[PDB]
């Protein structure tokens, strides 16, 4: 009940009651909040409510101090002072953007813009508020009960009447009932249990609505620039393999934190693992939001770093399968690879946070609270995909608003930029270079002459809202018969339901653009499926076409993106 003001830090007994996160607001700030918002409940040791029996006056503007107690205009004694006067709310120890964060529903992009352009304490207030809103919205959905079990990989579900049905995709990870987390993909649906259990009729599934903890640490610590490398001890026998990053690894030791923008295949994990070879005695904690991102850092470390000094931290609630070669849960090993939510409370010489476009400010703050490091390195690319914002339905979230790190990379530029793409045929590198990298990304590979584009709108059908284009898949089938080398291609599309249809018709492994991020394949077959803002998103398009090492086939719906593709056009 006695704390610090979330806007000006002045100590106060006042907490805003109408705020879902109940922030401490000082006398000047509590007033400016209650007089310009629907928020009128003020909390202290005792709430600011009328003390007269059976009275329901809770608005702080309609209340007064009757000596030591509180009363409305109808119950106050003659010697009563209003709680709201001269720009203050009465309390102990006697903002436009705070109001908007406190009262928004988080469905508009302008809400997220504000949550990243505001002061540092308001970024934390915005991040807990948003995460709390996102969790309380999980309750709004209806329960799914197993009505019948067809086989080991297929079932038929029964939904709650009156409550909406959450969108069916691998993004929504449910909690079965405690029979394990379960995921669903499309009247016969496919059931995916993270824990092997013989599907029971009658058992139900409910969302993993986890409690939102308060944020204490900033999203970014205050920046420190040094005259020499601090607390880190460099090598001189630094492997030629990593010689290109020597000036960048020194930049890492002469700053508290540093940002690395690495377009696809420019050497991000090679840079991250190479930083351990450059500072060979340094204890490095490698973190990222996803298990796949942490596993990709584990794979690179398995090749360059000693396996006995490595440890893959796995949370006791082992959700899905991850890296199995390091000693598990040995928190004290020199190299610790761990997802953000599983991080222990520890210190490090360097903390490497990879896939930074996928971090929220909540993730940025959590990392600063569990890890106290001499140096922090944020690696990623604001031209790649951000973390999905389940509440956001109106407006588009631009890269400078993904998180604090992305905001910096897009405004003042990144500290370091990996300028040479070594993965993709030059047709792809030149296309994304002009599209999202202002012509600063260079191709190492030659043009493969295996990058094709076809302008074919097809027919758009829908599985609730996830889209399907059977004619675009038919064009891919006609292409495969004529180009059998493409039999080893990964089918990619912006929609789960397009992927499910293509898996049955084509037999190729499938992946959504969002799940393909960080992965690479020799051949990629992309079908745009629709002309929505989702399928036309330049960051999603960039990720989609930069998955290919050798060739790509793009069946496009949008004239704009089709025209921007520096690929050989196919006919029919
Ligand atoms: Zn204040
Ligand atoms: Zn409030
Ligand atoms: Zn009253």
Swiss-Prot record:
Residues 237-418 form the (+)RNA virus helicase ATP-binding domain. Zn(2+) 13 binds at residues 50, 55, 72, 75. Zn(2+) 11 binds at residues 5, 8, 26, 29. Residues 1-105 form the CV ZBD domain. LRR repeats lie at residues 208-228. Zn(2+) 12 binds at residues 16, 19, 33, 39. It catalyses: ATP + H2O = ADP + phosphate + H(+). It is found in: Host endoplasmic reticulum-Golgi intermediate compartment. A ribonucleoside 5'-triphosphate binds at residues 262-269. Residues 419-572 form the (+)RNA virus helicase C-terminal domain. Plays a role in viral RNA synthesis. Multi-functional protein with a zinc-binding domain in N-terminus displaying RNA and DNA duplex-unwinding activities with 5' to 3' polarity. Activity of helicase is dependent on magnesium. Binds to host TBK1 and inhibits TBK1 phosphorylation; the interaction with TBK1 decreases IRF3 phosphorylation, which leads to reduced IFN-beta production. Interacts with nsp8 to form the replication-transcription complex (RTC): nsp12, nsp7, two subunits of nsp8, and up to two subunits of nsp13. Interacts with host TBK1; this interaction inhibits TBK1 phosphorylation and decreases by 75% IRF3 phosphorylation, which leads to reduced IFN-beta production. This is Helicase nsp13. It comes from Severe acute respiratory syndrome coronavirus 2 (2019-nCoV). The gene is rep. The chain holds residues 5325 to 5916 of 7096 of the full protein.
